Amino acid sequence: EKKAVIGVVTISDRASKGIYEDISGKAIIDYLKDVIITPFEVEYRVIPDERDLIEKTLIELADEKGCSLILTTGGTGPAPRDVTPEATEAVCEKMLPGFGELMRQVSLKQVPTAILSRQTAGIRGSCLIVNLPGKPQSIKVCLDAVMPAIPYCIDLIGGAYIDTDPNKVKAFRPKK
Amino acid sequence: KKAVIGVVTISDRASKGIYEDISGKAIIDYLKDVIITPFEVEYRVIPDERDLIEKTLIELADEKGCSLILTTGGTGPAPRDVTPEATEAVCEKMLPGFGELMRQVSLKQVPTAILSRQTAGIRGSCLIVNLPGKPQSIKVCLDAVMPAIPYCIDLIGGAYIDTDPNKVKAFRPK
Amino acid sequence: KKAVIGVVTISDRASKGIYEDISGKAIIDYLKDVIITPFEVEYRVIPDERDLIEKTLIELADEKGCSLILTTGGTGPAPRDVTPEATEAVCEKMLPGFGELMRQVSLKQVPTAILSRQTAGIRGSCLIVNLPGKPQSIKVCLDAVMPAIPYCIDLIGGAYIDTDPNKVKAFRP
């Protein structure tokens, strides 16, 4: 059986040179540990806002570390240096428009500027890559919104088996 | 102009063997139930081979004169699901609102609706729309987008289609 | 630094002088009504010709120094409706959330909202947003996206804009 490996990449020129506490990264890893009940390992990376480095990082995680899921945080706004979506589009062979649409929709509730987010999601081999926001409150609503479909998506692309605690988040798996 | 509607079932079972087509059935049943104007159906069941999908859509729009083509199948994240790609390839103008609405109305009952890559686009005077595969989802999606289809077809110079207002209100700013 | 907003009406009728532009005027009125900071308007009424749309958007952003450009017209399914195409052609980064929300908000009124291809993108320090036609559908879309515009402009190095919190709250994290 394939081992479940999950990538968590915090993208920020600032944090890349040092960060006392990666609140965004910690929130994401905390979430995963809480809701997931199947065995899995985390591959954490903190890199700057450099398109080529982000692409190479995602590639290393998916291709070398064998991640079935990679969650990024940061670099998805309208500013010129925010190139996480561009890097994500570049390494994936197929994008999932439903992710960005839903994440912005749930984020909009409390954040009117959620429509400025260029967060997306895509598939590279047997790995799903999802761009999350930076704010803890936004990260939470986005994960609550998309996690229910992640395990099944991973099943469909041949990734590692992941299951969640139905009491926190139920991993929807449609059957024949 | 004669109203011809294409219904294309794209199967990922061409090799495993097809024993039924409940998806195509749901679509044909829907069309017959709501459309009140005369129309014919060009039905195609093809394997999920990208070039064949594009070829089929081009034939239906260009040779068979369809004003609307409805597809089912091959719209998920799996690598073999390339219906959306084929659709983009044959269309000159895409309509993002279709995929958006279809994923939105399907979300409550289908959390995995965000995995769907269904889209919609225009090729000359023909509107092409990707539909899901589950009959229940097909009806839900068609109920959401059919209201704007007849009018969209008018705007691109396609054949006249009108539905039973007691079943589906084809909105026509007129 | 100076706040300049472009308002582009893409219509044949209006460009011929045989139709008053109720759309563009509604946009200008909206801006004058909600903005409380100093700004000027660069108004243009042009035919729906692909090349003229791109050149007008480029003139406004590059030569007139607009930090925001609002277009109206040519965003439907018809083959002549190429405002979105022209917008994509001049922007270096698109904003999918804008089209998503505008269609969302429009669905409330009419189901044909899904036929709209309105979008938005960035060119340098200028934000370009495609608005609807009816002066009424314009107010509705603007009420939905305006809250995030001033801040977007801040992030791309554009001019400072702020609105009347009693009319439209310009959200700034």
Please give, one letter per residue, the 3-state secondary structure of A67-121: CCEEEEECCCCCCCCCCHHHHHHHHCCEECHHHHHHHHHHHHCCCHHHHHCCCCE
CA gap A124, A90 in Å, rounded: 10
Beta-bridged to residue B41, according to DSSP, are: B5
* Residue B57 one-letter amino acid: L
Listed in sequence order, the residues at least 6 apart from C162 whose beta carbon sits closer than 8 Å to its beta carbon are: C35, C36, C37, C150, C170
Yes or no, beta carbons of A118 and C95 under 8 Å apart: yes
* Residue C148 one-letter amino acid: A
Question: Tell me: domain B1-174, CATH 1.20.1250.20, correct?
Answer: no
Report the residue from B95, B169, B173 with minimal CB separation from C117: B95
CATH architecture of the domain covering C1-173? 3-Layer(aba) Sandwich (3.40)
- Minimal CA separation from C38 to chain B, in Å: 36
Class of the domain covering A1-176: alpha beta
Residues of A in contact with C171 (CB under 8 A): 111-113
Half-sphere exposure of B31 (CA within 13 A, CB side): 23
Give the β-pairing of A121-124 and A127-132. antiparallel
Yes or no, beta carbons of A149 and B114 under 8 Å apart: yes
Residue in this structure with the two tokens 């390494």, named with its chain if needed? A91
Yes or no, beta carbons of A78 and C156 under 8 Å apart: yes
Yes or no, beta carbons of A156 and B115 under 8 Å apart: yes
Listed in sequence order, the residues at least 6 apart from B47 whose beta carbon sits closer than 8 Å to its beta carbon are: B10, B11, B14, B15
Beta-bridged to residue C72, according to DSSP, are: C9, C131
Listed in sequence order, the residues at least 6 apart from C59 whose beta carbon sits closer than 8 Å to its beta carbon are: none
Residues of C in contact with B145 (CB under 8 A): 114
Experimental method: X-ray
Can you read off the two tokens belonging to residue C31? 């801006």
CA angle at B137 for the pair B28 and A155, rounded to the nearest 5°: 125
- Minimal CA separation from A9 to chain B, in Å: 22
- Minimal CA separation from C91 to chain A, in Å: 12
Yes or no, beta carbons of A78 and C94 under 8 Å apart: no
Beta-bridged to residue A45, according to DSSP, are: A9
Q: How many residues does chain A have?
A: 176
**Nearest residue to B84 via CA among B127, B116, B45, B43:** B116
Stated in angstroms to one decimal place, the resolution of this structure is: 1.9
CA gap B120, B129 in Å, rounded: 4
Burial class of residue A122 in the structure, from the number of CB atoms within 10 Å of its CB (0-12 exposed, 13-18 middle, 19+ buried): buried
Yes or no, beta carbons of B151 and C103 under 8 Å apart: no
**Nearest residue to C113 via CA among B42, A69, B95, A55:** B95
Yes or no, beta carbons of C151 and A113 under 8 Å apart: yes
Q: Is C33 helix (H, G, I), strand (E, B) or coil?
A: helix
CA gap A39, A56 in Å, rounded: 26
Residues of B in contact with C108 (CB under 8 A): none
- Backbone φ and ψ for A30, nearest 5 degrees, come out as -65, -45
Size of interface A-C (CB pairs under 8 A): 59
- Minimal CA separation from B80 to chain A, in Å: 10
Listed in sequence order, the residues at least 6 apart from C26 whose beta carbon sits closer than 8 Å to its beta carbon are: C135, C138, C139
